[PDB]
Amino acid sequence: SEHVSFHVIQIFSFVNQSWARGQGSGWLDELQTHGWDSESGTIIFLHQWSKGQFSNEELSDLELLFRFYLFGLTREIQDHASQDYSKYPFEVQVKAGCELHSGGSPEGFFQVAFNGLDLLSFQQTTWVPSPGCGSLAQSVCHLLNHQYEGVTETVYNLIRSTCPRFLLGLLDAGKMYVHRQVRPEAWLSSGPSPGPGRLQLVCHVSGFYPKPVWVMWMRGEQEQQGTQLGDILPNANGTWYLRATLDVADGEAAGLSCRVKHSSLEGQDIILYWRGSLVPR
Amino acid sequence: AIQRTPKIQVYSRHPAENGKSNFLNCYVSGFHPSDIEVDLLKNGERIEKVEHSDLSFSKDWSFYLLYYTEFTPTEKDEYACRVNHVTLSQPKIVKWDRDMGSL
Numbered sequence: 001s002e003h004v005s006f007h008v009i010q011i012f013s014f015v016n017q018s019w020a021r022g023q024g025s026g027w028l029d030e031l032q033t034h035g036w037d038s039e040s041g042t043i044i045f046l047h048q049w050s051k052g053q054f055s056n057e058e059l060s061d062l063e064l065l066f067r068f069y070l071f072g073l074t075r076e077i078q079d080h081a082s083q084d085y086s087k088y089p090f091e092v093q094v095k096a097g098c099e100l101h102s103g104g105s106p107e108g109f110f111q112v113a114f115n116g117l118d119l120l121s122f123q124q125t126t127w128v129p130s131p132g133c134g135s136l137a138q139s140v141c142h143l144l145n146h147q148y149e150g151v152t153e154t155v156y157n158l159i160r161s162t163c164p165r166f167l168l169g170l171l172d173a174g175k176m177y178v179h180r181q182v183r184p185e186a187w188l189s190s191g192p193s194p195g196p197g198r199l200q201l202v203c204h205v206s207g208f209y210p211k212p213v214w215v216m217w218m219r220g221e222q223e224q225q226g227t228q229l230g231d232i233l234p235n236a237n238g239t240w241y242l243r244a245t246l247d248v249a250d251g252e253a254a255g256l257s258c259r260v261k262h263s264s265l266e267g268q269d270i271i272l273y274w275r276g277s278l279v280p281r
Numbered sequence: 282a283i284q285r286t287p288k289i290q291v292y293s294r295h296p297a298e299n300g301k302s303n304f305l306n307c308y309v310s311g312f313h314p315s316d317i318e319v320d321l322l323k324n325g326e327r328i329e330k331v332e333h334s335d336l337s338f339s340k341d342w343s344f345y346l347l348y349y350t351e352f353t354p355t356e357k358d359e360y361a362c363r364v365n366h367v368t369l370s371q372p373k374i375v376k377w378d379r380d381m382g383s384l
């Protein structure tokens with residue numbers, strides 16, 4: 001569609017020679033669409049449309065591939081760090097997936113972190129160490145490029161061929177279920193004291209999609225300088241929450257309001273009037 | 282990397298109305314490593330039935346989670362989010378408050 005991404009996220013925690021945990025999920029931009037069952041090693045389809053347009057045969061093969069990859073990764077890593085390597089515990093993060101850009105080619109990527117630091121990434125046919133993570137990254141890349149050579153071609157085809165085709169199907173399958181525009185609710189409250197002789201007003205805007213939104217405090221038609229947008233936080237099922245606050249000094253006159261503009265509203269802004277006190281506690 | 286202590290933000294989905302059902306959200310973000318204990322609390326006890334996302338992470342590789350559950354706000358009842366993590370010496374508790382923006 002526009003820029004839209006599909007991401008598989010994996011987290012491997014290695015606790016000792018005999019214990020590790022794998023965890024994984026699939027995300028359509030900011031909406032989780034897939035989980036992973038770590039007990040039985042299977043894909044969890046979180047929505048009715050999470051299979052996209054893939055057949056059960058294709059998804060069976062993909063589930064097997066994932067099991068093979070995860071068991072082999074665990075086995076190899078645990079083999080190479082034996083008994084008393086002071087590295088334990090450590091954690092490996094993997095971000096792999098694809099992006100569609102409107103009118104241009106898709107992009108595929110496969111990035112790895114060791115203990116939260118960039119380690120290596122996959123570059124079309126080669127594992128390339130991050131220039132920042134030194135000797136360990138070089139050793140891992142040696143093994144991946146020379147020993148497991150015959151799976152490079154899989155990774156490439158997975159992230160650059162299979163992933164875009166799947167994402168296109170997923171987007172198409174969600175069209176009978178998912179909203180492209182969700183309207184927010186909004187309400188007013190007070191906030192914590194900004195200081196003596198002052199109070200804080202809060203305009204809450206909850207449950208809107210997509211993410212771009214405009215919110216300002218107003219005196220009639222005059223936008224107020226003290227308006228400040230908070231961080232935008234997630235809600236359930238890929239929607240968003242925002243707080244817009246205003247600091248007010250003792251002596252400000254009644255008649256303030258909050259005005260919310262959003263594409264889901266399309267010409268009918270929400271306007272909320274403050275009906276409480278403006279005398280600071 | 283360096284260990285990163287989690288940031289905790291608490292907020293309700295709908296305007297708070299005593300005796301009317303609502304949803305309580307807790308967004309925990311920016312932390313590393315991934316081992317974490319997040320609970321939503323009603324009067325200091327963990328709510329046994331909650332919804333949570335899977336772990337995701339930002340592009341600095343730090344993790345984030347979203348928790349939410351149904352709840353009915355009340356004069357007496359205290360609802361909160363409790364987090365423990367290796368960067369924390371004991372569990373950190375962030376209370377939900379109407380008279381503030383739960384800010």
Ligand SMILES: CCCCCCC[C@H](C)CCC[C@H](C)CCC[C@H](C)CCC[C@H](C)CCC[C@H](C)CCCOP(=O)(O)C(F)(F)[C@@H]1O[C@H](CO)[C@@H](O)[C@H](O)[C@@H]1O
Nearest residue numbers: 008024025026034036066068069096097151154158163166
């Ligand atoms: C925690 C897991 C993730 C969570 C899942 C969450 C759910 C998931 C989001 C659901 C969405 C599905 C979408 C469509 C995914 C879209 C693409 C994604 C971006 C790609 C991400 C890259 C993946 C992760 C890495 C695997 C590559 C590995 C290096 C290759 C394995 C090589 O193994 P292999 O040797 O080549 C063999 F093929 F297995 C052989 O096959 C024979 C069979 O007959 C067998 O008998 C032989 O012995 C042998 O095993």
Ligand SMILES: CCCCCCCCCCCCCCCC(=O)OC[C@@H](O)CO
Nearest residue numbers: 068069072073076077080136139140148
């Ligand atoms: C059925 C598939 C078989 C394998 C699955 C694919 C996973 C392969 C990944 C191998 C990773 C191995 C990591 C090795 C780490 C290491 O060897 O460390 C080097 C030190 O010597 C640093 O100096």
Ligand SMILES: *[C@@H]1O[C@H](CO)[C@@H](O)[C@H](O)[C@H]1NC(C)=O
Nearest residue numbers: 014015016017018019020021
């Ligand atoms: C490895 O860690 C797991 C999880 O803490 C523990 O149950 C197990 O006893 C440990 N194994 C050894 C050999 O220490």
Ligand SMILES: CCCCCCCCCCCC
Nearest residue numbers: 073077080081092112114140
């Ligand atoms: C000592 C442990 C090194 C960590 C190895 C991580 C390599 C992940 C790349 C797997 C791609 C198939």
